Design an enzyme around this catalytic site. Sequence first.
Site, mmCIF file in Angstrom:
data_model
loop_
_atom_site.group_PDB
_atom_site.id
_atom_site.type_symbol
_atom_site.label_atom_id
_atom_site.label_comp_id
_atom_site.label_asym_id
_atom_site.label_seq_id
_atom_site.Cartn_x
_atom_site.Cartn_y
_atom_site.Cartn_z
ATOM 1 N N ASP A 1 0.753 -1.185 0.121
ATOM 2 C CA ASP A 1 0.114 -0.061 -0.199
ATOM 3 C C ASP A 1 0.782 1.323 0.021
ATOM 4 O O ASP A 1 0.260 2.291 0.627
ATOM 5 C CB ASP A 1 -0.985 0.124 1.123
ATOM 6 N N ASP B 1 0.913 4.104 -1.603
ATOM 7 C CA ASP B 1 0.284 5.033 -2.306
ATOM 8 C C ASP B 1 0.967 6.400 -2.051
ATOM 9 O O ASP B 1 1.386 6.834 -1.219
ATOM 10 C CB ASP B 1 -1.169 5.192 -1.786
ATOM 11 N N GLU C 1 2.265 1.766 -6.310
ATOM 12 C CA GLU C 1 0.797 1.828 -6.134
ATOM 13 C C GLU C 1 0.171 2.971 -6.667
ATOM 14 O O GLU C 1 1.004 3.705 -7.535
ATOM 15 C CB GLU C 1 0.609 2.076 -4.591
ATOM 16 N N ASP D 1 -5.799 7.591 -4.697
ATOM 17 C CA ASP D 1 -7.062 6.954 -4.311
ATOM 18 C C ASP D 1 -7.922 7.525 -3.420
ATOM 19 O O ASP D 1 -7.568 8.106 -2.279
ATOM 20 C CB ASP D 1 -6.384 5.383 -3.753
ATOM 21 N N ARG E 1 -7.417 3.931 -14.608
ATOM 22 C CA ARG E 1 -8.085 4.600 -13.593
ATOM 23 C C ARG E 1 -7.990 6.126 -13.432
ATOM 24 O O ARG E 1 -7.366 6.754 -12.627
ATOM 25 C CB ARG E 1 -7.653 4.161 -12.433
#
EC number: 4.2.2.2
Length: 352
Positions: free
Chosen positions: A129, A131, A166, A170, A218
């Site tokens: 993770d 990010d 990552e 998000d 995305r």
Amino acid sequence: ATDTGGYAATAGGNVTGAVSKTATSMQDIVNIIDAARLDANGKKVKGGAYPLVITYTGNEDSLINAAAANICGQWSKDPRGVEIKEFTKGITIIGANGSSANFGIWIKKSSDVVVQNMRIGYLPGGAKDGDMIRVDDSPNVWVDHNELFAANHECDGTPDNDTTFESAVDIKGASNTVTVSYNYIHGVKKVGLDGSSSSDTGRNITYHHNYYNDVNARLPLQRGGLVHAYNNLYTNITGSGLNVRQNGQALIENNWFEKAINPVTSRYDGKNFGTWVLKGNNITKPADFSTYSITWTADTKPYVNADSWTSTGTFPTVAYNYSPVSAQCVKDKLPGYAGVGKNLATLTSTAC
């Protein structure tokens, strides 16, 4: 002023009684935030004792440059990030011109957070993770004028073959209102989701004046809610762009698309396709696909592509006040306003 040009309405830490602090490192930021939780008597105050404006003057180019030279060595390292958990008095993190970070900002259950002028890239910990920016259960967040990058590449042997690096931004949970603007995102495989799962539907996000270059997918992967994407420059999209799912609604206006595969689609669920309102983009009809090198692909499950380039649903009245520039103007000018060191400059019609 609380106007962000999108759904988020916040001034972050630029309020009355804000205390300004200078962070010269990641640790300084952690320490500054902890201290900002203590009242005059040293007792802790739920949500923070006072508003903060943290100017980050640190520079981690050495880490970034080392990482850029050994891309496949990043995912297995420990992730690095500053957590802004349950801080609601208002906070702004502004990078000083010339500052850089090889660590992320993870916002969790906070409100009124502004992250600006941060150059974040090649973060370690893609398998755990790592990010760059994460907005979780955090309404009224404004991610503006940052440069988020890495390499649009997947190394061999990474867990799930999706963890080389990552996400850039998000958004998940109850981050009800968020504005992502003037960011220069490049060399990122998974830019950012909007809802972590099929059940994580909702939110009102605005993506405006972002410059995407060499990204795989995305932009965002939207699950429900509303997304207003205007004045963005989308170039070199290697997988898919806006993926409108779980009945989400999107208003896609005055953007410039070029060298993009599946720029606007609803795929991977095989059902509950979202809708889009297309207007003012550089592409106005299918004839333009050839002109701007826009290709389309199918999916193994039922999907819907905007290959007819027509609106497939409706969009509610855009609550906020914004004034979009033309798609041509973004194409011409956007690269000089998006990113770090532009002194938070905005593109207006007068500059067109």
